[PDB]
Amino acid sequence: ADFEVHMLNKGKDGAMVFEPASLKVAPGDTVTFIPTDKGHNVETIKGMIPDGAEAFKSKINENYKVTFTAPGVYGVKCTPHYGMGMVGVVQVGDAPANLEAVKGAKNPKKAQERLDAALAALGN
Numbered sequence: 001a002d003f004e005v006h007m008l009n010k011g012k013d014g015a016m017v018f019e020p021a022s023l024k025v026a027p028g029d030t031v032t033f034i035p036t037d038k039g040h041n042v043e044t045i046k047g048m049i050p051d052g053a054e055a056f057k058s059k060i061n062e063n064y065k066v067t068f069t070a071p072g073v074y075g076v077k078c079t080p081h082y083g084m085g086m087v088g089v090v091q092v093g094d095a096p097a098n099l100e101a102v103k104g105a106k107n108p109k110k111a112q113e114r115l116d117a118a119l120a121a122l123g124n
């Protein structure tokens with residue numbers, strides 16, 4: 001399955017958002033991060049990627065397709081807008097094994113708020 005996440009200046013949850021900010025996929029699915037607004041990118045957050053994943057960081061304005069192979073929870077940010085809370089979560093598979101690290105990872109306040117809401121939306 002191939003999914004899309006929009007990078008937006010304004011969305012349902014306010015300014016500087018990924019929509020959807022919460023997504024559950026299967027191993028081998030893809031997610032494309034779409035630069036619907038300019039000025040955004042996607043980057044994995046420190047501490048928020050599972051065993052066997054590779055860190056990643058797109059270029060600003062890049063239409064960025066990730067194939068998710070390693071199971072677990074991924075926290076992503078927009079690099080410039082991380083302090084404004086531009087973040088999202090992708091869960092790959094069921095029963096993610098890296099929740100403790102994910103939940104303990106440090107983040108700016110607005111980021112943490114949105115991450116925690118994304119995680120709760122995933123039933124995590």
Ligand SMILES: [Cu+2]
Binds near residue numbers: 040041081
């Ligand atoms: Cu951004």
